Write a protein that binds this ligand. Structure first.
Ligand SMILES: Nc1n[nH]cc1-c1ccc(Br)cc1
Length: 123
């Protein structure tokens, strides 16, 4: 149907916007602490602590499959990256501190992303 095509165009547009947002957010992680999944070989007990692991590579996989239907779903995954890290790692660690900085700097980006999604009507 034409309606289905239009819906798919909207999703493709959202995906383009979220790709830009994801690039901007990952730039706020210059240490690449959040670039890849926590290794279950190097941290074998990780899943005892963290029930829903997340990282930028995994987000990017879902993104390119057009797997984010709206900004909320994307933000959920970004918050998992931050929140998982701030639970597993103590306050005095380079990991926890990196998550705080990513959260703070990323908030700015996500604030305008929300305005843009609403403005252009992408969801
Ligand atoms: N990036 C993370 N999110 N949750 C835990 C971690 C982590 C834990 C140990 C090391 Br070593 C590195 C990273």
């Amino acid at each position: 149907s034409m309606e289905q095509v239009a819906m798919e165009l909207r999703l493709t547009e959202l995906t383009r916007l979220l790709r830009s947002v994801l690039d901007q957010l990952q730039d706020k992680d210059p240490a690449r602490i959040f670039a890849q999944p926590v290794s279950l070989k190097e941290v074998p007990d990780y899943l005892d602590h963290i029930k829903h692991p997340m990282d930028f590579a995994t987000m990017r996989k879902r993104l390119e499959a057009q797997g984010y239907k709206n900004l909320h779903e994307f933000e959920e995954d970004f918050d998992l990256i931050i929140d998982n890290c701030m639970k597993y790692n103590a306050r005095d660690t380079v990991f926890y501190r990196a998550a705080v900085r990513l959260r703070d700097q990323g908030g700015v980006v996500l604030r305008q992303a929300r305005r843009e999604v609403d403005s252009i009507g992408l969801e």
